[PDB]
Symmetry: C2
Subunit: 125 residues, 2 copies
């Protein structure tokens, strides 16, 4: 798998990481530890994130609270368009934390709270 999603229940959202990102993630694990493990975790294609159908019952992209920065750049223009389609705004992608904000829940929560990230007040995940 190219990418792995993990639920972050404290953020009411998900994180995603990729095979090329060697860094720690807010799940407490690297892509590699996540890959070894695979229930709240799922292997996916990178392009699945910007598909119409992406975790729709959970609110789709509005649930995403962290991705590596290189995943943001890869998806950038599609992701901005989808944000606009879903009513989230062109700048939703900057509401999503990444490794420049931090790699742990402790470090990203305040950012997410400060940016008003919609996951924080959506139905529980």
């Amino acid at each position: 798998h190219e990418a792995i999603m993990a639920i972050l229940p404290e953020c009411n959202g998900i994180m995603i990481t990729t095979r090329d990102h060697a860094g720690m993630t807010p799940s407490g694990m690297t892509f590699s530890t996540l890959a070894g493990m695979i229930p709240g975790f799922m292997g996916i294609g990178r392009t699945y994130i910007v598909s119409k159908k992406f975790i729709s019952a959970d609110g789709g992209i509005a649930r995403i609270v962290w991705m590596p920065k290189s995943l943001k750049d890869f998806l950038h223009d599609e992701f901005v368009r989808r944000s606009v389609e879903e009513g989230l705004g062109e700048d939703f992608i900057d509401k999503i934390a990444d490794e420049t904000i931090g790699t742990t829940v402790d470090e990203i929560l305040p950012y997410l709270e400060e940016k008003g990230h919609p996951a924080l007040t959506m139905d529980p995940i």
Copy 2:
């Protein structure tokens, strides 16, 4: 439940936290968040004195798996826990090889401490 255990795959070990401890834990969750979930695999609600029983997760290696607990749980269990350490071949000072919130509340913060101290979970078989 008095306490919740959670697996920390990256440390090859478990953490435990308690009903009364408000802080973030290296699972990326607080106790209430953890409680809300197990009302899940890799999480288990337990009594605190289970930790010092003879059978404490024996197939997983018992107390040797624990890499993080809050300082207040260490104080509550201290004498019992030190005695069990000695019985398990881990030394009286095992308890100080375990991280707590003075060392960090995240995997990133505790890993180098556990590595510096030679915490045995890191070299045991996979959890």
